[PDB]
Amino acid sequence: HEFPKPEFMSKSLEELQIGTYANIAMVRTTTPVYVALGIFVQHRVSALPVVDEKGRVVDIYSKFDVINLAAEKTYNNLDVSVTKALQHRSHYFEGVLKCYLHETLETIINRLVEAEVHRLVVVDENDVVKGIVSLSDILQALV
Amino acid sequence: HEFPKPEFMSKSLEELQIGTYANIAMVRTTTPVYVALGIFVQHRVSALPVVDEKGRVVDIYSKFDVINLAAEKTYNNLDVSVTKALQHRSHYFEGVLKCYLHETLETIINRLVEAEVHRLVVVDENDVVKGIVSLSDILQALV
Ligand SMILES: Nc1ncnc2c1ncn2[C@@H]1O[C@H](COP(=O)(O)O)[C@@H](O)[C@H]1O
Ligand SMILES: Nc1ncnc2c1ncn2[C@@H]1O[C@H](COP(=O)(O)O)[C@@H](O)[C@H]1O
């Protein structure tokens, strides 16, 4: 009773039916942090894909990013774009932002662990949002 | 419209009424990972204080810790204690595990950001659990 079972690890996200693929809440690179703050508190989601003018995912903005902004010693207000979080980290260029439905659970779990991130955005061939896979999604499938 | 407002940052957790102080789900240092996995999926909480034989908090076990276990290349099963997560990180010795009600939001936010952790356990003078403060708790108060 290996954990995880090898047969699970070799299956794809699509095969295991892992992730959320409807009603995804997301923002734009030009969205102010106040908009994200309001979504997090009132809509109750943990992270928001951030898309460019073409609809392509370039970041994911999380509750922790807001707290990190709050801790900055320099003066900020909430009118700053969510892209200021990119000064702290680049999920995009580290290859720990996106995934595809055909990737295996082994690949997804290793990518999450590589950068200690808690979700990935599932995208299409144009880097447009199809869904989100979070640690909760993976745990549900493991049981 | 500084973010966060300085008057918020100077107030304590108790003053701002931030955190969960009832119905805290928690485990022991001798608890197997399978028990934690079942709590995470069925009880739907994000992290679990881990307490020793005296009831004192010595770690906090999170969904990410399970995923980190899953990614280990060595052979594991779920009968291993939750304390195996301590091979990867020590929240305790880094001083990023616990907090007190009288600490300021500035102190709490800086401690969360220091180690990039998403919650702290609120404890008493004996390191026994009183509650949990997570990023969601802090955001609710910021709005
Ligand atoms: N931006 C989002 N929009 C919709 N669902 C989301 C979003 N972020 C996470 N989820 C889903 O919310 C559930 C809980 O995720 P987690 O908050 O990370 O515990 C999972 O099924 C995620 O796939
Ligand atoms: N082990 C736990 N038992 C009870 N409440 C918890 C626990 N962990 C987190 N919470 C609370 O669950 C809510 C959502 O936290 P978060 O999952 O981190 O978004 C917050 O009000 C936390 O204080």
Swiss-Prot record, chains A, B:
Binding site residues for ADP 2: S62, K63, F64, D65, R89, L97, H118, R119
Positions where Phosphothreonine occurs in the chain: T83
Binding site for ATP 2: S62, K63, F64, D65, R89, L97, H118, R119
Consequence of changing D137A: Reduced AMP-activation of phosphorylation of PRKAA1 or PRKAA2. Does not affect ADP activation of phosphorylation of PRKAA1 or PRKAA2
Residues annotated as binding AMP 3: T20, A25, S46, A47, H118, S134, L135, S136, D137
Signal peptide range in chain numbering: none
Comment text on domains: The AMPK pseudosubstrate motif resembles the sequence around sites phosphorylated on target proteins of AMPK, except the presence of a non-phosphorylatable residue in place of Ser. In the absence of AMP this pseudosubstrate sequence may bind to the active site groove on the alpha subunit (PRKAA1 or PRKAA2), preventing phosphorylation by the upstream activating kinase STK11/LKB1.
Record's protein name: 5'-AMP-activated protein kinase subunit gamma-1
